[PDB]
Amino acid sequence: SDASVIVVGAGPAGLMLAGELRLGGVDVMVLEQLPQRTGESRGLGFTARTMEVFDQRGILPAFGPVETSTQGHFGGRPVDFGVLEGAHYGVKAVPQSTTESVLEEWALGRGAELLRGHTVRALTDEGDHVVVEVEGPDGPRSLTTRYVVGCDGGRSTVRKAAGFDFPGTSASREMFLADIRGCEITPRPIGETVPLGMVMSAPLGDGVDRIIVCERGAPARRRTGPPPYQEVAAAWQRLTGQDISHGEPVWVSAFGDPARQVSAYRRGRVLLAGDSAHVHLPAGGQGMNVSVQDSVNLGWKLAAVVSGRAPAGLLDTYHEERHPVGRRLLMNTQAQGMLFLSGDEMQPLRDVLSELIRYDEVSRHLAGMVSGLDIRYEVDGGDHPLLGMRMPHQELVRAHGKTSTTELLHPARGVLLDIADDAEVREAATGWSDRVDIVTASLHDAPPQGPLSDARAVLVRPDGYVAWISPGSRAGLTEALDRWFGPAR
Amino acid sequence: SDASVIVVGAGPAGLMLAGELRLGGVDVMVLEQLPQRTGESRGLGFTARTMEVFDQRGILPAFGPVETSTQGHFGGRPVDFGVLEGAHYGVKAVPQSTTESVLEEWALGRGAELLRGHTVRALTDEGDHVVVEVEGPDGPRSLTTRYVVGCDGGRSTVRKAAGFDFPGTSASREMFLADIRGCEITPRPIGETVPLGMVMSAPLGDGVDRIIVCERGAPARRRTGPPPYQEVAAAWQRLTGQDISHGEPVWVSAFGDPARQVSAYRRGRVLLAGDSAHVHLPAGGQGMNVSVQDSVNLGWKLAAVVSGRAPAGLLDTYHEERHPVGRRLLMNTQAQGMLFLSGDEMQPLRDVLSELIRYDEVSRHLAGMVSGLDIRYEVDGGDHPLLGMRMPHQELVRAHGKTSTTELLHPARGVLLDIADDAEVREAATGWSDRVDIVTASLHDAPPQGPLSDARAVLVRPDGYVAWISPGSRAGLTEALDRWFGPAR
Numbered sequence: 001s002d003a004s005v006i007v008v009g010a011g012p013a014g015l016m017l018a019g020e021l022r023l024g025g026v027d028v029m030v031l032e033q034l035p036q037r038t039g040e041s042r043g044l045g046f047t048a049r050t051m052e053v054f055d056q057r058g059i060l061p062a063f064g065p066v067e068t069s070t071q072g073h074f075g076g077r078p079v080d081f082g083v084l085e086g087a088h089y090g091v092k093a094v095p096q097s098t099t100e101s102v103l104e105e106w107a108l109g110r111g112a113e114l115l116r117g118h119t120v121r122a123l124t125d126e127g128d129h130v131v132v133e134v135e136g137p138d139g140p141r142s143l144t145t146r147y148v149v150g151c152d153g154g155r156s157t158v159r160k161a162a163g164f165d166f167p168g169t170s171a172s173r174e175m176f177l178a179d180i181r182g183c184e185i186t187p188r189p190i191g192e193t194v195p196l197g198m199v200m201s202a203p204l205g206d207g208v209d210r211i212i213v214c215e216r217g218a219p220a221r222r223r224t225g226p227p228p229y230q231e232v233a234a235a236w237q238r239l240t241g242q243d244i245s246h247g248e249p250v251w252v253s254a255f256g257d258p259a260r261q262v263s264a265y266r267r268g269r270v271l272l273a274g275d276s277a278h279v280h281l282p283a284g285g286q287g288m289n290v291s292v293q294d295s296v297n298l299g300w301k302l303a304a305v306v307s308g309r310a311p312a313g314l315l316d317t318y319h320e321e322r323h324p325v326g327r328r329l330l331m332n333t334q335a336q337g338m339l340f341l342s343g344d345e346m347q348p349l350r351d352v353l354s355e356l357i358r359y360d361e362v363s364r365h366l367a368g369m370v371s372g373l374d375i376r377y378e379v380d381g382g383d384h385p386l387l388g389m390r391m392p393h394q395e396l397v398r399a400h401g402k403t404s405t406t407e408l409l410h411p412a413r414g415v416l417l418d419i420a421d422d423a424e425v426r427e428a429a430t431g432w433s434d435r436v437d438i439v440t441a442s443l444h445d446a447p448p449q450g451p452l453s454d455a456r457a458v459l460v461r462p463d464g465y466v467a468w469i470s471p472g473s474r475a476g477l478t479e480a481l482d483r484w485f486g487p488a489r
Numbered sequence: 490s491d492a493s494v495i496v497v498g499a500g501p502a503g504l505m506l507a508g509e510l511r512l513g514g515v516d517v518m519v520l521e522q523l524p525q526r527t528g529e530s531r532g533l534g535f536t537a538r539t540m541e542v543f544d545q546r547g548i549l550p551a552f553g554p555v556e557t558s559t560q561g562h563f564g565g566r567p568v569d570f571g572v573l574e575g576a577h578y579g580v581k582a583v584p585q586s587t588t589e590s591v592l593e594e595w596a597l598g599r600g601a602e603l604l605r606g607h608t609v610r611a612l613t614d615e616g617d618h619v620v621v622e623v624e625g626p627d628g629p630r631s632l633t634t635r636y637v638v639g640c641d642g643g644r645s646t647v648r649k650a651a652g653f654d655f656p657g658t659s660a661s662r663e664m665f666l667a668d669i670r671g672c673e674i675t676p677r678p679i680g681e682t683v684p685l686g687m688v689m690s691a692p693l694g695d696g697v698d699r700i701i702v703c704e705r706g707a708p709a710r711r712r713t714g715p716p717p718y719q720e721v722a723a724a725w726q727r728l729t730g731q732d733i734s735h736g737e738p739v740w741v742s743a744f745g746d747p748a749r750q751v752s753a754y755r756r757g758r759v760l761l762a763g764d765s766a767h768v769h770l771p772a773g774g775q776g777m778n779v780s781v782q783d784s785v786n787l788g789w790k791l792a793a794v795v796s797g798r799a800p801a802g803l804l805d806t807y808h809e810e811r812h813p814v815g816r817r818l819l820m821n822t823q824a825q826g827m828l829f830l831s832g833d834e835m836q837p838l839r840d841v842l843s844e845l846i847r848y849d850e851v852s853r854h855l856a857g858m859v860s861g862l863d864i865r866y867e868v869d870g871g872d873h874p875l876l877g878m879r880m881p882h883q884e885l886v887r888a889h890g891k892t893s894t895t896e897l898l899h900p901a902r903g904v905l906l907d908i909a910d911d912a913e914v915r916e917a918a919t920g921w922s923d924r925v926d927i928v929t930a931s932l933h934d935a936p937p938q939g940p941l942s943d944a945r946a947v948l949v950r951p952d953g954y955v956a957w958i959s960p961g962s963r964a965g966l967t968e969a970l971d972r973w974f975g976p977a978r
């Protein structure tokens with residue numbers, strides 16, 4: 001068995017997972033077909049929760065000094081993300097290429113094995129293990145592993161190989177994206193409706209503008225490689241009345257509006273994460289974020305099962321917790337795109353949306369949805385609001401020195417947070433001290449009526465979601481720890 | 490001068506106005522080109538506020554015993570209208586033909602002059618008066634009046650004649666509506682998306698179903714008379730896979746999605762009200778309601794100016810108060826229609842809408858918008874919530890006998906409501922007792938913390954909107970009465 005887990009594809013999803021797996025104490029092998037990273041940088045910046053999952057692991061400093069704004073939109077419509085206590089829009093500029101850069105450097109630091117110029121062509125789940133056919137630099141090889149995770153993007157080889165179900169609709173439009181030099185092109189962050197469809201445009205920073213075009217009737221086409229630049233340019237004139245012949249392209253590509261999502265996130269011993277599981281219209285910046293977050297859901301869980309520390313039942317929760325999120329990803333993103341991408345025909349409906357956004361409830365809700373902060377998993381049929389949601393960053397007073405909720409998650413074991421000083425709780429948990437870090441501290445600069453007010457103790461999973469809280473969970477701590485970390489030692 | 494005011498067109502708008510004008514103590518002449526009423530009954534039922542404006546005048550009993558539900562939609566999406574204190578969806582079934590029937594019988598009762606088989610062909614505003622060319626039963630006549638009000642529907646002759654501005658967009662789709670017999674056709678109140686577009690269908694009551702069809706690519710066409718039935722039928726099969734050859738039609742018509750609204754509601758001495766001022770996609774049942782309400786805004790005001798009781802400045806408020814409402818009518822209705830009328834392509838966006846509707850703020854807001862109960866006019870830059878909104882029905886204790894806010898508006902003079910017993914207020918107003926009914930009473934079954942709690946007095950315009958409230962208006966009662974009823978006597 002050449003490695004415990006084989007990850008195929010080394011994009012955000014795969015890189016994040018490879019790291020998460022290593023921290024989980026597991027050897028891992030990433031096969032990526034590309035020899036050197038794309039150079040395309042599709043998305044710009046990342047969401048609040050993606051910011052937080054990076055921070056959970058001490059990855060943010062590698063990004064260089066960065067900014068975070070509260071001014072963002074839901075499908076063009078400005079939403080102030082402040083209205084939801086402790087939320088914001090994200091980190092502003094960062095190109096995917098740099099995120100991907102970062103995460104590679106990380107996981108390699110975490111001792112993951114990355115094999116480039118390695119293309120997976122077929123695979124078979126034999127029951128106790130999985131075999132994988134690979135065309136690499138020196139030729140075709142055959143590898144054996146305990147789990148394979150398809151992180152190979154929108155047209156996943158893995159998903160087709162392992163026989164997944166991929167229901168949904170194929171694309172109906174073709175849109176263009178170009179990053180151009182030289183031309184003197186107006187900003188259109190919200191975009192702009194022109195009789196023949198819509199356009200958008202923004203500046204990025206050193207001589208380069210992004211254009212997006214949507215010629216209304218354009219059919220969907222499968223193509224070999226990007227469109228030739230002059231074809232996009234031709235499209236831009238027929239829409240704006242601007243000639244961009246003279247433009248020198250950096251990247252040019254076509255893309256579309258599909259909506260498909262695997263009906264099961266796991267089959268036997270093969271799993272999918274990122275684009276490979278859910279493919280959609282790129283809109284409201286979600287693709288990378290939600291994918292990276294799939295990896296953070298799965299990583300620790302898989303680590304546990306691989307090493308015999310958890311019953312395979314823990315791994316099903318990856319499906320149960322994420323299919324829903326990916327489904328909402330299709331919903332969120334297609335909605336957002338339809339507002340963004342339509343005629344003067346969609347104007348009435350964004351006029352009402354603008355009217356509704358004005359409330360607090362509404363403004364929170366979409367700021368919740370976009371940022372990924374509204375995620376609540378099923379964990380316990382109890383009263384408390386925080387149950388099953390993410391654990392917010394809160395500074396803590398440890399014996400000698402201050403520390404943070406966020407920093408205790410650096411190692412990716414569970415965190416049990418004794419705040420009231422109850423030896424009774426640190427005892428019930430002793431049988432798990434190998435898997436959960438029992439920490440006893442007090443709160444520092446809490447907002448006197450916040451989510452941790454009147455909380456004696458909290459159980460935080462390795463992905464930083466809350467699994468159990470005192471008071472106000474149906475189940476005792478014993479039931480809870482067994483659920484997520486395995487039997488008592 | 491043959492009559493004070495000439496109203497052209499005797500639909501909901503014109504009939505309502507003719508009545509409102511008579512109560513205002515003014516002779517009025519309605520010219521309608523049709524000799525006998527259409528027989529078509531496009532809309533079904535009416536909104537809360539339309540219910541209330543009818544009731545303001547004692548018109549509801551003529552309707553026969555009727556029902557009112559709280560279960561309605563915003564563009565297909567179920568909204569419980571209850572969530573907004575004292576709101577609901579409307580009266581359920583009533584066909585326009587019966588409403589039109591009712592209102593005719595009313596205004597004739599009110600002593601309005603209705604001239605049928607009379608078609609207005611041209612008109613000239615001469616400054617001090619207006620002339621009107623009319624082809625009637627015995628021939629062409631020329632009439633003279635002080636005001637003309639275009640209530641002649643979507644293709645208003647008046648509006649074109651008097652030279653109005655009618656900006657907006659002409660229709661882009663063609664939809665079909667048919668009322669059929671015999672066929673066994675499924676209900677589709679929310680409608681239903683079929684690959685080739687959308688359909689809807691409901692039952693109405695004695696053997697007759699309504700179908701609506703939207704064949705996606707259908708262009709807009711100007712036509713002489715309705716479409717032939719077999720053309721709609723052909724459309725229905727190409728969409729549903731159902732043959733309705735055998736169907737016997739009662740009414741068949743085509744209709745579309747325009748969006749236009751006169752930029753000024755008044756020019757010199759000519760005015761517009763109803764369809765003639767604002768034309769749109771029929772969706773969310775608004776056309777009749779908002780139009781009838783234009784007439785109720787204008788009627789009393791015009792009555793005042795015609796008879797020299799108010800300075801012409803009162804009449805401008807008809808524009809200032811209603812252009813905004815009509816504008817929101819275009820917005821409301823086109824939004825609602827776009828959700829209702831689109832592919833599986835609009836599904837994500839009604840999925841978020843369904844999510845937002847779940848709140849209270851949102852559910853109220855749309856229930857407000859649809860019912861027409863959210864209307865607040867500019868009247869005074871003051872704190873109080875009720876200022877400029879409609880006066881809600883509240884039972885009152887008069888000297889001998891109980892009565893209601895609603896019943897005091899039967900005569901269509903203003904109502905000043907002394908509740909605290911303050912002779913100081915009944916004095917300031919003495920100079921207007923000719924135009925305002927000074928009433929002193931106490932509240933009956935008020936909801937102990939309602940909108941009239943801690944209110945000494947209220948000034949209610951003839952259209953039943955609140956103009957001044959103690960406490961909490963910038964202006965004193967004197968300023969207020971002069972604003973709406975004219976100088977002190």
Ligand SMILES: Cc1cc2nc3c(=O)[nH]c(=O)nc-3n(C[C@H](O)[C@H](O)[C@H](O)COP(=O)(O)OP(=O)(O)OC[C@H]3O[C@@H](n4cnc5c(N)ncnc54)[C@H](O)[C@@H]3O)c2cc1C
Nearest residue numbers: 009011012013033043120152153274275285286287288289
């Ligand atoms: C126009 C554009 C703009 C976007 N903007 C945003 C944004 O603003 N915010 C956001 O969050 N998302 C955005 N996205 C979406 C985002 O780019 C994707 O979600 C994300 O980059 C893909 O995640 P992934 O790691 O699962 O797959 P990918 O990034 O596609 O990586 C999959 C990898 O698998 C490798 N691979 C595939 N098949 C094999 C195989 N047979 N063997 C070995 N390796 C294989 C590929 O080489 C590839 O490197 C945008 C997308 C587009 C197209």
Ligand SMILES: Cc1cc2nc3c(=O)[nH]c(=O)nc-3n(C[C@H](O)[C@H](O)[C@H](O)COP(=O)(O)OP(=O)(O)OC[C@H]3O[C@@H](n4cnc5c(N)ncnc54)[C@H](O)[C@@H]3O)c2cc1C
Nearest residue numbers: 498500501502522532609641642763764774775776777778
């Ligand atoms: C498919 C359909 C369904 C609808 N459903 C609803 C609904 O559910 N709820 C709702 O509120 N609204 C609905 N409406 C809209 C509603 O029907 C219109 O708003 C309303 O009936 C028109 O109001 P009106 O009185 O201003 O004009 P009209 O009702 O059009 O009447 C204008 C009158 O003027 C007369 N006229 C025109 N020109 C002249 C002239 N030259 N000389 C003399 N007379 C003239 C005409 O004969 C006509 O009788 C619907 C409309 C359609 C088409």
